[model samples]
Target chain A: SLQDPFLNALRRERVPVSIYLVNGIKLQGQIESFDQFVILLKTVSQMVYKHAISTVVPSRPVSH
Target chain B: SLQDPFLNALRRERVPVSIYLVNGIKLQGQIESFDQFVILLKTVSQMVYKHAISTVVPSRPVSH
Candidate 1:
């Protein structure tokens, strides 16, 4: 499970991708670069936002 | 369409697992905590690093 097959698709060429976080925000961008902990996302307009790419757990509902 | 199902495995148990990133790095840790945008991973060794787990699309990488 440590070997990520996710990047296999991006290696062919730079493509647009979408990332859904746990908090409730979804981001679409290119996988510019990444490490063991961080991911550099280049948005459609070439805006890069570095984020901690970790888990897929969503936040508990406000009412729950 | 930005939903993520990757966390289902961790939610079942605080078991040890691995995480793979785009930069050719892999992580194996415990699911300490997480959110829509960030994940707190208690690595098997309790290490450092973090992302907003999202969907993975290989056909087109562009996010609009």
Candidate 2:
């Protein structure tokens, strides 16, 4: 799936990402791991609920 | 997963939802079905990528 590949590419490269939430909050971290419902973001390893996430912007372009 | 159960409950109840996307787009529909990567929303049956989604707000509360 596109989600998996995109996330995998970011994780593989350890790219920093800016994640925007639905309520207009922003979080910055590296992709640690993810499943259907949640994303584990490093830089203290915060667990982000996928339902609350809006956008994930990587610092660098990734090829996947 | 929390996502599955939450979505399933909404689908079962035929609940209307307000979905917020990362790009600031808002989609309103009832959930037809969902998988690991995407959600099929009725009201024209739009296929929404889970990665691009920010939040799913049901018109009413759902017990899941």
Candidate 3:
């Protein structure tokens, strides 16, 4: 999936991220793992539903 | 999946929606279909990548 490559790159690089939700909430963490339905974020290990996510911004530029 | 139920409801109801993208683009349409990676919206049948989407707001409240 298009999302997988980008997310995998972030995880592989251990990049910190800022995740924005549809409701205007922001989550900061490193991506632990992600699948078709959810992202496991490691700011105390939160499992976020992908349906509610808006964006995943890496702390720095990544090529993937 | 969590998104499927909601998207299916929207499609079944033929509800108009405002989709907000991560890049701040807004798309207006009815949900044609959706899957693990893409949502087919029928404002001329645009195939939107789920990774870029931020929100999907129905024109009115919907029960899924």
Candidate 4:
């Protein structure tokens, strides 16, 4: 229904929607050592999403 | 590997499963608190089979 403009005709009030997501604590707070953890995760995610997204596994990998 | 050892075999008969996730939208135009911005995320979970579970991550607040 959200994809259909007509289904939402009643809500024609025109509301703006924003989706935000996040997680975890910061290294800068604890001792400044773990800040590197975020950097490392970014690197890993970059490699994973950009490259490994395709070659990582098949059908989300069910070992059974 | 689950990043571990015999946990794998035990986990095999143990029927290791990844996760089940879904998102849905509910609009009760007659409900309360429109401008106050209230959305209920009701969740139900079930496992077709039973097994041992060690780790869990609860939903918590974080800034990204």
The runs of at least 3 residues in candidate 3 whose Cα sits more than 4 Å from the true structure, single-residue gaps closed, are B1-64
Name the best candidate (by TM-score). Answer: 2
DockQ, prediction 4: 0.03
Q: What is the C-alpha lDDT profile of model 1 across B1-64, one tens digit per residue?
A: 2333445445345555555544444545665554444444550222122433222222222222
1 versus 2: better lDDT goes to: 2
Per residue, candidate 4 scores C-alpha lDDT tens digits across A1-64 of: 1112211221232222111111111111111111211211221221111111110111111111
lDDT of 2 by residue, B32-63 (tens): 99897899998279999987876566777776
List iRMS (one decimal) for every candidate: 11.1, 8.8, 9.3, 17.6
Distance from true position, residue B10, model 4, in Å?
3.7
lDDT of 1 by residue, A1-64 (tens): 2212233234235655555443335666666665544556661443333443233221221110
> Which window of 10 residues has the lowest lDDT sum in candidate 4 chain B?
B28-37
lDDT for each residue of candidate 3 in B1-64, tens digit (9 for 90 to 100): 6788999999999999999898687878898677678776661344466877878999999998
Residue by residue across A1-64, what tens digits does model 3's lDDT show? 4456677888999888887776678899998998878889992899999877765667777655
Candidate 3 scores an iRMS of 9.3
Please identify model 4 stretches exceeding 4 Å from their true place. A1-64, B1-3, B14-64
> What CA RMSD would candidate 3 show?
9.3
For residue A51, what is the lDDT in candidate 3?
A: 77
Q: Give me the TM-scores of chain B across the candidates.
A: 0.52, 0.95, 0.93, 0.17
